[PDB]
């Protein structure tokens, strides 16, 4: 007949940002570095 | 020569164009193809001619095949209709 | 098939048109709210900086942005060019048109002082129609070729100009050439002769 | 100082800029952009062409935004005629207007990056743009300069499968935005290249007539889709993404948000598009249907006259502005009673923005100028007209 | 409605210096491009898998012919009076059958804009704008089409045109 | 201010028209005549200023009509004899004004054709 | 109080109530030298008065703003200061005078 | 007039006849406006044309097929607002929007009738009358057309 | 009749500008030939300048001479700067264009147009 | 369709679900050849529905000062996402 | 259609179709530009590769220039090129003798064949270009040969125009340049130090305008012509004029022609293109000619252009940077000779 939205709506699309915060913390990060870097000295 | 003449005179310098080339000329002349068609016999005094289609053919005009003397020809299809 | 319109606007703006005409009686020659619900204050050319300054800096009429400056050329009128300035008020969400008339030889002032947007538009009006803007910083051709002769959007200028360009081997440069067009532009006289009942 | 204009022919001059520059050592003392390199005479030619046969001049003013340029003219010619498009057509123009804002922004954000030096964002988004072109090709017939938003409506109805396919694109497009989002928003390199570059203060932006994301990036609240609504935008809900520091980054972030907000508007248009016809039914303004012109005489006469002569819009003049992706695009159409216009001043968001380049790019080096042009989203068709 | 876009305890201060010194934040971009070499390229094999189109695709012009074999063009001049690029010249005559047909028809395909204002104005469906888009030419003369490079052109794609006309006629 | 000049406003040096198209070219101010083929009088009300007709020739390759008269498609439209003569004099063209030809009033009566 | 007026340039102005009173009061004066019955003096003195009327009737900024119906007060000021400049500029251009010159004939008839 | 049609019925058709070698009467076009009959009887004194039949069947023509041979003949073309009878030589050579119209004078005869020469792309396509109250008041001879 | 002055009031006053442009151009021709690597000789060019400044040597409406200077100065700016390339400047010399004959018999003999 | 390891490579490296949002169209695409449609089409005198003739020529036109229009209502921060 | 029907320029037509055979080199690219700007069709027979005929495609307008392949060995290529023409022009000529073609072929055999077909096809004019001071026993293999052919041309196709140009200068020339090139190798090893030999040099355009005027000039039939040029200069002075204008140091150390003949031999040996050769060396030093009585450029309608004027354009390249910007009045003034 004529293109028209599917009865009951198309559905929901997401538009908002989702850049997902994640990651090691700083205290932990550094402590692996120095821990890998004292072992390099011993 | 195209269905509409155009044939260049031998002297015409406008013939170089086709040297090492050729001439685009349609072999299917509509003057003859339409003559190779059966006069559409009809019963009614007047007849329609949608161009063999509704909205895919030519505007719809009614032709008066009223005189056997002349087979009406829709100005659009060139189709002769034999009363 | 009849525009959905609001009469509130016609009235509100009409009222502003009387306000502007009262506040500036010396420069405004005619104010009219068209039926498209837009306003047009027609000012004497001398009123170009006064009228626009009042609109840019008045609490009851702040018209901060210059939408555009353009010049219709009606060749019949004595003062052919009709410079038209369209302005927008972000504060009151409304728009106004101030239009003044300028002839080929009589320059009008430059509003670059009132709005710095006009620095470019005024250069384009000079290049396109030949109107000159007084005390305008750097007026010079914006759109036409560096050596172009003639003002193009004037109604008396041929569509296709008088000069065209081509590369001439003999001189190894892009040389101009009087215009020869291989197919003149068929000008169609399509305009009905039965006028519409108003 | 040293006069080394940017390149008329340049790998990054957006085609045709000359931008003569004075080089005070590394930094640029002054810029004098020499546009005119693409002035085809669009406004002169329109005076010699009927209102339908001039629509095409418009999709070729800002070729990145095709159908929004047309939507201006179409709104301008409708107001002069005092006719309004049918309800379905108005939603279709808002549906296509938002697809154009996504495609303009994908153009502006990704090309800015390749100028900066980031090359991959362009490729990922351009495949997403070819998907969108296909939507223009599958409704109009062309992938560009469609000439679909004509006076009175759209030229033809949406094909039977378009709205499902627009849902599938909009459904997955959001991930593609933040994929570019993670690539450019937090990188040291992008923020340093973009943050605090070309700051424009609020009053200066209004005075220079910026009127666009350049206006909103500095924090001024103005969209023209919520201030002076056109079509049916008054029935769709969206949030203007205004800015706070009026600089490249804040302006970038605003452009990425409007792509997201446009997906919200496209979502509403698919959900609520009305059954109806796509063009006004007065045959004295929009052509008659193919079946009608081939079966009824009044329709043949109306088709013959409309195509050969024209609408003959009533004498008057109007300035109609719509929020084109770049900024306020307006047509000042002066009309005599004749079928062909008398004047058509295309206000180009871009003539004002490029003027601002000298003020915005002051105390900035050669590399900053490449970012300054990129953040004005200037395409020279609109500026040169 | 408006939306703001861009508007210290040691935990936070170390976190900031762990994202500036041992860069961890340009890494969220390197893994982001590593996420794409392992996906399937979108490239189509071009010459063998031409991209997708629509029956509406406007390309190389062609003059349709009535099945019978009679040219459909009745030289109205309803298609150069609208052609905005001013590209068409269709000088005509009575064809000596008494019928009405062209002796001349023309497009300069270096002026046309593929706008299809000629296929929607034609009251007979003679001039169409076919789905060709591989007709590039090494010369300028091969683009100034005549009535015989448009009619045998239309004597070529008519199997492929009519399907698309019949496919879109209702919407038009 | 208000300096006085004593001459027509010759802007021929400001127009930018190549000399030969400002010298050997005659404008013809006239109110277009009606298309006998129709009876509409709306196309015979405004004075037009059209230029002389120069060579319209044939493009050897395709047979199209070609021309070298830049001012060929030019039909400026004025609203009175006075305003057309002014523009032509303004631009330095030669004019050939043609007075308007409004039909005179012809008395028409239905019954008249019934007399004998 | 307010950390930042949204608009980039306009900077937070402490003592909004004060800055205004001075700017508004100066203006109420510059208008004085205007001809008795000059629309500008008659109207701009009608506005400046109402704003000085609220600038002193309400001491909470956010509140004040709503009343003056402007943007951030840092803006109500920006405007108060510009009207003053127009008021000075107007007293020289003497806009109140009779029209300079009536349009030439038929300089505003569009269907020409 | 009206944007649409309500005539969902069958149209009529008349039979094309030959009125001469100058006038092509595709009279199924005729709106029975009787201008032709009058001109033929009041300007040209040739009363050969006439209405035949009543009802919708009224046909405006020459009952027996006698050609309309007279000078002043071609004016019928210009005077029939419908394109029922039009010019046979200028049958389908052009279409009016294209025709560039230059106003000139008749040289075939010494009345010096005013005429408009309609030229397209540089060859004359038709010469039709332009009104001169005193000399040719809207009419031109069969020779000079 | 009365007319506002564009920049000068009397033709004499204006001519002061016309000369202040001649000088400028004259003192520039030499520079251009060298800068734009043009091939025409300084003398040759300086000739052109006089020709032009001379071509316009008949108008008496100050406003027009007030206007041609401006247009005139603008053309210097571009030429003084190198905003104009060789192509632009050399176009003042109709290098390829075959000068049209003027003799009647010379025109009758070619081209139906006057 | 990709080896799960390779695709988990792209999900882990991207940080986002990636099987869901494909940039490639496999069955997502509507098939062509949609069934033919049937588009939707007294006192309908054009003199009543005249948009073109409805318009009229422009109107030409103690007291209290009047603004061009009531001052624009200031917008308010978005409820779903005030800051992004 | 020999009726020119248009305002002069591209898109007009002067109605003269023409086959200009040597339109791949130096002189024919200017001929096509004038015949072309004169809007006349030009059937340009090219045996080259299309990539090198493109430079010709814009020197004309839509349809004006037509190309077709021709090889001198076979006719029917000469025949179809001249089949629809009315004008024919011969510009064939090669300095060296490639293994496949001798001065015999490029100057006699070939022009003869072309002219053969020219008369056969009915072309009215067979403009032929033989060298000035080029007669039999002119002690140079080519020049002698060239004249032999001039006869063959006249015999087969009488009423032919024969232009005999002097040395032709102009951009991309091999006259001024050969001399200019000497800069690269040592210094000008002129013979007779360059004195005792005088040359009249003519600009390519002057010759090109003449050939075009001749194709369209009625009295030109059966008329030989010598396009000598405005000034006669001694060779030493002209090399010195090439230098100074070239802005590179000049040294006219002398040597004899027997040695020099031997020298170029080796250069000729070069497979691609002789930098110089015996035949060239001869036509430079020994070749000297005083025109006496032959209608000239002025006679045909061209004002010969002096070398004093258009020498920047052809030597401004041979300067080192820092001198490139040098103007003309600065160039070392030259001086003319009579001898
Ligand atoms: C306590 C034990 C005894 C003492 C031990 C020693 C003391 C502790 C040492 C801690 C060292 C921490 C890391 C320091 C080195 C890293 C480089 C660095 O210092 O960062 C500089 C720069 C920071 O950038 P920015 O945010 O602009 O900071 C400046 C702000 N004005 O960084 C940059 O922006 C550079 C960006 C350039 C582009 C990078 C692109 C990504 C590169 C990925 C490489 C992947 C492979 C790396 C490994 C290769 C191995 C061969
Ligand atoms: N200064 C001068 O140059 C002077 C020249 N002349 C005469 O004028 C004529 C034109 O001179 P110019 O153009 O400089 O000479 P070129 O060396 O440029 O050769 C002329 C043309 O002839 C073609 N040609 C050469 N050999 C052959 C061959 N064997 N078969 C087919 N075509 C060939 C060349 O094309 P291709 O690249 O395909 O070989 C070239 O385009 C010459 O014949 C010469 O005798 C006379 C006096 C002075
Ligand atoms: C390549 C390198 C050189 C480039 C060549 C052109 C460069 C020059 C460029 O055109 C600039 C120009 O000509 S702009 C001058 C135009 N003309 C006027 O500005 C007014 C002159 N004419 C008059 O003022 C009056 O007619 C009058 C008779 C009173 C004075 O005449 P006079 O002084 O007494 O002779
Ligand atoms: C947006 O402006 C620009 C273009 O126009 C759309 C370009 O084509 C180009 C060149 C295009 C490519 C693919 C290098 C550049 C660099 C550009 O900045
Ligand atoms: S093509 Fe269609 S429109 Fe153009 S002329 Fe032939 S029929 Fe009339
Ligand atoms: S497509 Fe548009 S431009 Fe090309 S021909 Fe048909 S109408 Fe003219
Ligand atoms: S005039 Fe034309 S229309 Fe009126 S009746 Fe005679 S023929 Fe029929
Ligand atoms: Zn039919």
Curated annotation (Swiss-Prot), chain B:
Belongs to the complex I NDUFS6 subunit family. Its main location: mitochondrion. One of its GO terms (cellular component) is mitochondrion. The chain holds residues 31 to 113 of 116 of the full protein. Mammalian complex I is composed of 45 different subunits. This is a component of the iron-sulfur (IP) fragment of the enzyme. It is a peripheral membrane protein. This is NADH dehydrogenase [ubiquinone] iron-sulfur protein 6, mitochondrial. It is found in: Mitochondrion inner membrane. One of its GO terms (biological process) is respiratory electron transport chain. It comes from Mus musculus (Mouse). Disruption phenotype: Male and female mice are fertile but produce smaller litters and pups have a lower neonatal survival rate. While mice are normal during the first 4 months of life, they are prone to rapid onset weight loss and sudden death after this period. They display cardiomyopathy associated with a doubling of heart weight, impaired systolic function and a reduction in functional capacity. Males are most severely affected, with a propensity to develop cardiac failure and diminished survival after 4 months of age. Defects are due to membrane respiratory chain NADH dehydrogenase (Complex I) deficiency.
Swiss-Prot record, chain E:
Its EC number is 7.1.1.2. Binds 2 [4Fe-4S] cluster. Its cofactor is [4Fe-4S] cluster. It comes from the Eukaryota. Its main location: mitochondrion. The keyword Ubl conjugation does not apply. Belongs to the complex I 23 kDa subunit family. Core subunit of the mitochondrial membrane respiratory chain NADH dehydrogenase (Complex I) which catalyzes electron transfer from NADH through the respiratory chain, using ubiquinone as an electron acceptor. Essential for the catalytic activity and assembly of complex I. This is NADH dehydrogenase [ubiquinone] iron-sulfur protein 8, mitochondrial. The chain holds residues 35 to 212 of 212 of the full protein.
Curated annotation (Swiss-Prot), chain F:
One of its GO terms (molecular function) is NADH dehydrogenase (ubiquinone) activity. GO terms for cellular component: mitochondrial inner membrane; mitochondrion; respiratory chain complex I. The keyword Phosphoprotein applies. Keywords: Electron transport, Membrane, Mitochondrion, Mitochondrion inner membrane, Phosphoprotein, Respiratory chain, Transit peptide, Transport. This is a component of the iron-sulfur (IP) fragment of the enzyme. Interacts with BCAP31 and TOMM40; the interaction mediates its translocation to the mitochondria; the interaction with BCAP31 is direct. Belongs to the complex I NDUFS4 subunit family. This is NADH dehydrogenase [ubiquinone] iron-sulfur protein 4, mitochondrial. The gene is Ndufs4. The chain holds residues 51 to 166 of 175 of the full protein.
Curated annotation (Swiss-Prot), chain K:
Its main location: mitochondrion. It comes from the Eukaryota. The modification N6-succinyllysine is found at residue 137. One of its GO terms (biological process) is proton motive force-driven mitochondrial ATP synthesis. It is found in: Mitochondrion matrix. The modification N6-acetyllysine is found at residues 151, 332. Pfam families: NmrA. Acetylated on lysine residues. BLOC1S1 is required for acetylation. Acetylated by CLOCK in a circadian manner. Keywords: Acetylation, Electron transport, FAD, Flavoprotein, Mitochondrion, Respiratory chain, Transit peptide, Transport. The keyword NAD does not apply. Its cofactor is FAD. Binds 1 FAD per subunit. One of its GO terms (cellular component) is mitochondrial inner membrane. GO terms for molecular function: NADH dehydrogenase activity; protein-containing complex binding. Belongs to the complex I NDUFA9 subunit family. Complex I is composed of 45 different subunits. This a component of the hydrophobic protein fraction. Interacts with BLOC1S1. Interacts with SLC2A4. Interacts with CLOCK. Interacts with RAB5IF. Accessory subunit of the mitochondrial membrane respiratory chain NADH dehydrogenase (Complex I), that is believed not to be involved in catalysis. Complex I functions in the transfer of electrons from NADH to the respiratory chain. The immediate electron acceptor for the enzyme is believed to be ubiquinone. This is NADH dehydrogenase [ubiquinone] 1 alpha subcomplex subunit 9, mitochondrial.
